[PDB]
Design a protein around this ligand. Structure first.
Ligand SMILES: Cc1cc2nc3c(=O)[nH]c(=O)nc-3n(C[C@H](O)[C@H](O)[C@H](O)COP(=O)(O)O)c2cc1C
Ligand SMILES: Cc1cc2nc3c(=O)[nH]c(=O)nc-3n(C[C@H](O)[C@H](O)[C@H](O)COP(=O)(O)O)c2cc1C
Lengths: 374, 374
C-alpha cells in the first residue's frame, strides 16, 4: 500500500521539500559568468526553467582552489552570494525550487586556472590521464587544456576543505537556496577519495571503504549541519570511469554510502548513470533494487532519459524522480513538453560552454496559442 | 529567533506543503465551464499562473444542490473529476501547487439554477435580501437574478451535506490536488451557519457560538480525514456583511474557530478582509495580532493588496502569505511582476464571468526580451 503509481507530474516529498513534479533539472556547467558572480542572465536562464520539479544548479566552486573551469560561479565571496540571492529570488518568483551543487574539481584542474598558479590538490599525487579542463590563457583566449599533476592533500589539510564546504553551505542558506547537493560524482574531488584508483592515501582517509568515504561523509555532515539532512542531497557515479578515474570497489562503496547516508537521513541520492547511448558499461543487474532497499530517502537517476524510460523507473519503484540535463538545456519547459508529448528543441553542443545568451536563454518555449508576451 | 524577515519571494511551509513564494492566487469564480467539467481551457488558464506560491481554485460545487452560479465547475461526478485531473496535472507540469475550494452557495441560489427546480437550502428559512445569483434562463440567455427564499435544513439532513463535502474531498485527492480549502466565507452555506443573522436554528447546530460552528467544523473534520489537516485550509470573512448576511458575534466566532482549528492543526486560515478601497468597515485594532497568537498555523489574508502592503503584513508578523484575486486575473505572472516592480495589466471586469478565452487566458506575460514562443 506504500508504493502507489506515481507519474512524471505526481508531486514528491524530497526530504522536507515539496516538489510539483518529478522532472528534475540536472546540474549543468554553462560557464556563462565571466566573473564568478551570477547576474541577471542567470536570473533569466534559471527562471525560464522554474517549472522543474527541482532545479539542481550548475556546479559551483566552494573556493578559488576548487576551480577547474573558467567563467564558473563561485560561492565563497559576498559578491557571489549576493549574485546568487538574485538568482534564487528569481527562481522563487516563478514557482521553482533550487539546490546549489557544491563543487571541488580536485585533481581535474591546472595551475593556469588555479589561483596564483597554485598546484591542484587531490587525495593522491596522481595526474588525470587525458583529462582536460577549461582554462583562460594569458593572451585572453580560453579553451581545453590538459590537466596537471596534483599534490596529495596533507592529513591536517582535509579539515580546511570541509570548512570550505561548510562555508559554502552557510552562504547558500543565507542566499535563500532551498537545498544543497554535495557534488561527489564525475570524478571530482570527493569522488577521487572514494575511488580506489585515485585514492592511494595511507592515513585515515584512505586504504579501506570506510576510509575512502571518511572525507566525503565529513563534507556531508558539515553541510547537513547548516541545511539539515532533510534539505541535503549528494551526487554519485559508482561504476563511472571519468577523467582517468578507476575503481575496484564500485558496488561495495555504493552499498556502504547508501547505508551511511540513509542512517543520516539525507533527502536524496542523485546517480548519474555510467550508461551512454553510444558506449560505456552498465549497472549490475539488481543494483537499482538494492539501492532502493538500502536507502529509504529520495532516489534520483540521470542519463540519456526520455519521458518513457523515466516513467519506467518510477513504475519499477527504483527511482522517485529523474533528472534531465541536455534536454533541459534546449527546453526550458521540458516537463510541459513531456505532458503534451510535444517535440523537443534540438540541443546545440557548440554553445554549451562560454558565450552569453545565445544557446543559453534563446531556446523557445512551447506556443499553446494562448500565451502572449505583450 | 523564531520570526525571521520573510519576503514575498521567501519559501513558506504551508502545512506539509512547500511553497516557492508567498504571492497566492485567491479563489476566483470565472464561469468558463458551460458544463461543470474543466477542460483544456482551464489547463491553460491555471497553467499560466502556475508560478503562484499556491493556486486556490475557483469555488467548485460539491453537489448539484450546492450550485448558485451557472457554468461553474463541479466535483461530484467522474467526468468532472477527470476534467480536474487534467487541470491538476497541467498545473504540476508547470511547477505549481493547487487547492480545490469546496463550494456550497446555501441560500444564495434560485430554483432556476437549482437542479429540478428544487428549493435552495440553508440553516434558516431567510431570504438573502438584494442578493443575486448567476442563472441561465429558459430562453438560453443568462444573467443576474434575485436569490429565492430557502428552506431550513432538517437536523437529520446536515449529515448528508457533510458527506457531500467528504465525497468532494475524496475525488479531489484522487484527482491529484495538493490541498482543499473549505469555503466558509462570502456568505456561502458554511458562513450562513456561523453568522447570527442567518442562523436562527434551535437544534444543536445553532443558538450559540459552539452550535453555529458545529456544522462548519464537521465539514472541516470530514475533509481533513481525507487530506489530513496538514493539507487542509479554510476561508473565512468575520466582519464581512455580504449577500444580506449580518453577524452580532464576529470576533467571538473568529476567536473560537481560530482556537478549534489550531487544535486540529489546520494548514491555514484564509481571511478575505471586509475592507474595500471604496467603502466598508474594517478589522478591529488588534484583531490581526490576536489571530496570530490564537492560530499557530499559516495565516493568509486577501483584499485590495499590492506588493508593498503585502510585505507590511509579513513584517508585522500578522500574515505568512497574501492572496491576490483580480491582479492574478489580469497578470498570470504576478509574482514576477512584483519582483521587478513591473507595471500590472489592467483587469477587465466585463470578462470576469462567462465567455471563453477572451479576458481569461489572453492577459499577456512580461516580456524579458529573452523568452521566445517559437
Ligand atoms: C554542458 C554540460 C555541463 C554539465 N555540467 C555538470 C555539472 O556541473 N555537474 C554535474 O554533476 N554534471 C554535469 N553534467 C552532466 C549532467 O548533469 C547529466 O548527468 C548528463 O548530461 C546525463 O544526462 P542527460 O542525458 O539528461 O544530459 C553536464 C553535462 C553537459 C552536457
Ligand atoms: C470575478 C471574481 C470571482 C471571485 N470568485 C471567488 C470564489 O469563487 N471564491 C472566493 O472565496 N472568493 C471569490 N472572489 C473574491 C476574491 O477571492 C478576493 O478575496 C477578492 O477579490 C479580494 O481580493 P483582490 O482585491 O486581490 O481581488 C472573487 C472575486 C472576483 C472579482
Amino acid at each position: 500500500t506504500s508504493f502507489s503509481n506515481p507519474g512524471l507530474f505526481t508531486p514528491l516529498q524530497l526530504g522536507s521539500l515539496s516538489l510539483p513534479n518529478r522532472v528534475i533539472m540536472a546540474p549543468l556547467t554553462r560557464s556563462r559568468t565571466p566573473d564568478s558572480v551570477p547576474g541577471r542572465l542567470q536570473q533569466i536562464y534559471y527562471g525560464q526553467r522554474a517549472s522543474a520539479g527541482l532545479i539542481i544548479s550548475e556546479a559551483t566552486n566552494i573556493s578559488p582552489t576548487a576551480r577547474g573551469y573558467v567563467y564558473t560561479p563561485g560561492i565563497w565571496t559576498d559578491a557571489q552570494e549576493a549574485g546568487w540571492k538574485g538568482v534564487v529570488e528569481a527562481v522563487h518568483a516563478k514557482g521553482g525550487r533550487i539546490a546549489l551543487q557544491l563543487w571541488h574539481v580536485g585533481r581535474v584542474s591546472h595551475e593556469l586556472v588555479q589561483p596564483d598558479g597554485q598546484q591542484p590538490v587531490a587525495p593522491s599525487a596522481l595526474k588525470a590521464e587525458g583529462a582536460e579542463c577549461f582554462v583562460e590563457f594569458e593572451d585572453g583566449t580560453a579553451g581545453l587544456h590538459p590537466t596537471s599533476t596534483p599534490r596529495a592533500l596533507e592529513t591536517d589539510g582535509i579539515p580546511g576543505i570541509v570548512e570550505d564546504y561548510r562555508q559554502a553551505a552557510q552562504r547558500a542558506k543565507r542566499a535563500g537556496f532551498d537545498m544543497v547537493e554535495v557534488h561527489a560524482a564525475n570524478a571530482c574531488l570527493p569522488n577521487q577519495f572514494l575511488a580506489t584508483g585515485t585514492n592511494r592515501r595511507t592515513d585515515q582517509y584512505g586504504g579501506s571503504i570506510e576510509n575512502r568515504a571518511r572525507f566525503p561523509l565529513e563534507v556531508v555532515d558539515a553541510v547537513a549541519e547548516v541545511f539539515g539532512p532533510e534539505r541535503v542531497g549528494i551526487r554519485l557515479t559508482p561504476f563511472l570511469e571519468l577523467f582517468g578515474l578507476t575503481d575496484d570497489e564500485p558496488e561495495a562503496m555504493a552499498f556502504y554510502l547508501a547505508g551511511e547516508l540513509d542512517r543520516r537521513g539525507l533527502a536524496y541520492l542523485h546517480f548519474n548513470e555510467p550508461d551512454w547511448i553510444g558506449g560505456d558499461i552498465t549497472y549490475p543487474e539488481g543494483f537499482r533494487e538494492q539501492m532502493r532497499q538500502r536507502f529509504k530517502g529520495g532516489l534520483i537517476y540521470c542519463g540519456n532519459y526520455d519521458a518513457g524510460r523515466a516513467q519506467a523507473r518510477l513504475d519499477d519503484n527504483t527511482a522517485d524522480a529523474v533528472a534531465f540535463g541536455r534536454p533541459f538545456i534546449a527546453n526550458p519547459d521540458l516537463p510541459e513538453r513531456f505532458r503534451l508529448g510535444a517535440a523537443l528543441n534540438e540541443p546545440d553542443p557548440s554553445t554549451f560552454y562560454g558565450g552569453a545568451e545565445v544557446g543559453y536563454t534563446d531556446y523557445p518555449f512551447l506556443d499553446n496559442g494562448h500565451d502572449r508576451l505583450g
